[PDB]
Every structure is written in C-alpha cells, then in structure tokens.
Write a protein that binds this ligand. Structure first.
Ligand code: SAH
Ligand code: AZ8
Length: 225
C-alpha cells in the first residue's frame, strides 16, 4: 500500500496509527465535509463518473418509487431521481445551499434531513436506497450499524445501490490530510461486506473515473431472503 491521489485535489495515505474512536471520528468526519463543501472542494459533485450510480439504481427499480439518498451532498442524484418521478428523501451531515432550489422545484416530492444516516428513524419506508460514496468514509466499526439502518429502512423487495472506491489489489484503509478515512474495495470484498449485512448482490459495475485514472465499484443488492 502506498499513498496516491483519490481525486483531483487529495492524496490519501495508508493508515498506520490507531484509529480515532467512532465517537471522535464522527466529528473529524463532519469537519472535513463542511469545510470541503464551504470551500468548494467537493470535487466529486461535478465528476462525470459519479452519474451512472443513480441510473443503475433506477434500472433496478424500473418504476417511480420511494428512494433514500444516503449522504446526498448537493443533491445531483436526488434531482436525477426526482426527474424520474420518484419521491426522494435526501440525508446528509452537511446541508448545502442547493437544497433550497431543489425544494422549490419539486415541492412535497422531496424531503431533506440534515442528519447522520444512523439517526434516520423508521422501517420499510423505501423501495430503493442510493449510497453514492458515503459508506466508504465511515469508521470500520460503524459499517454494520450503518448498513443495518439502510437494511431496516428498505421494504422487503427493496434495492440498495452503493458506490465505493475500487481497489487495485486487496483493499486497504487510507486517510486524507484532514484524517477522513477512505476504504477502497475489490468486488469480492464489497460483496462479502453486503452479504454479512444481509444483502444479496445482484449487479456490480466498474465505472471508470477517467480524469482521476481510477474506478468506482457500483454494486446493487436486494435483501437476503
Ligand atoms: N454518516 C453519515 N450520514 C450522512 N451523511 C454522511 C455521513 N458520512 C458522510 N456523509 C456525507 O456523504 C457524502 C459523501 S460525498 C458524495 C456526495 C453525493 N452522494 C454525491 O454523489 O455527490 C458527503 O456529502 C458527506 O457529508
Ligand atoms: O474526498 C473525496 N473525494 C472523492 O472523489 C469522493 N468521491 C466519492 N465519494 N467521496 C469522495 N470523497
């Protein structure tokens, strides 16, 4: 494992020190994202390679439905889903100014919540859920509770689409200069994680990130029977 650029601006290096506890990490996590969005360093928002994941989830739904956008950012994917006729709930640690014009365009068809995914209450409220680059920044000790919440929020025939950094070789854990964590996955590793969280993968796609010289791994799953 060696340091490498993960996006236009940020180099990430393998973690070697002991990880901050999940409680302290949640603060490191929010701090980097609010600074990145404030500064306009959310280079993922306009990355072309980020667009296929939402179309992939819709393809697995096949009809207008009720969709959770987990870690929705500025709302690009939320807008995409709303244009397909979905009712969308968009959730993020950081509320960007773009949520207001989205609310003005789509009215009651969109709901925004500025909270952690883990805070979302309810069960069996969604037909689909999109995680477009959120899970792979969580504390590893929080993967299970994060995925369990998504699992509980989906209806029995729900579909979950998740996009992660694809690893070259066995995936490892990295951190950026702000100490935000980055996990890269191989397809077997991501499939193993979803299966352990009681999801059954039904699709996976290697989405090129041409300007970054990398790939996203975009996997779609149903609940395990
Ligand atoms: N535990 C958590 N709960 C909710 N949102 C989270 C989170 N951890 C990270 N995030 C949010 O997840 C996003 C990852 S960046 C990807 C943003 C968006 N999905 C897009 O496609 O452009 C950031 O907006 C970050 O604020
Ligand atoms: O720092 C980040 N850079 C990225 O390119 C990215 N892409 C998807 N999700 N999170 C990201 N975080």
């Amino acid at each position: 494992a060696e340091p490498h650029y993960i996006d236009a601006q940020r180099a990430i290096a393998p973690v070697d020190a002991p990880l901050a506890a999940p409680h302290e990490y949640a603060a490191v996590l929010r701090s980097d994202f609010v600074s990145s969005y404030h500064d306009g360093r959310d280079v993922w928002t306009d990355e072309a390679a980020m667009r296929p994941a939402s179309a992939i989830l819709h393809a697995h739904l096949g009809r207008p439905a009720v969709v959770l956008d987990a870690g929705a950012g500025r709302g690009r994917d939320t807008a995409y889903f709303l244009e397909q006729g979905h009712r969308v709930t968009a959730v993020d640690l950081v509320e960007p100014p773009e949520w207001a014009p989205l609310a003005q365009r789509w009215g009651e068809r969109v709901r925004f919540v500025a909270c952690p995914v883990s805070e979302l209450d309810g069960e069996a409220r969604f037909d689909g859920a999109l995680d477009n680059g959120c899970l792979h920044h969580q504390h590893p000790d929080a993967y299970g509770t994060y995925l369990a919440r998504i699992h509980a929020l989906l209806r029995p025939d729900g579909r979950f689409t998740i996009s992660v950094f694809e690893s070259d070789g066995p995936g490892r854990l990295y951190a950026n200069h702000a100490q935000r964590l980055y996990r890269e996955f191989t397809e077997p590793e991501l499939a193993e994680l979803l299966r352990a969280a009681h999801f059954t993968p039904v699709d996976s796609q290697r989405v090129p990130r041409p300007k970054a010289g990398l790939h996203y791994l975009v996997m779609t799953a149903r609940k395990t029977d």
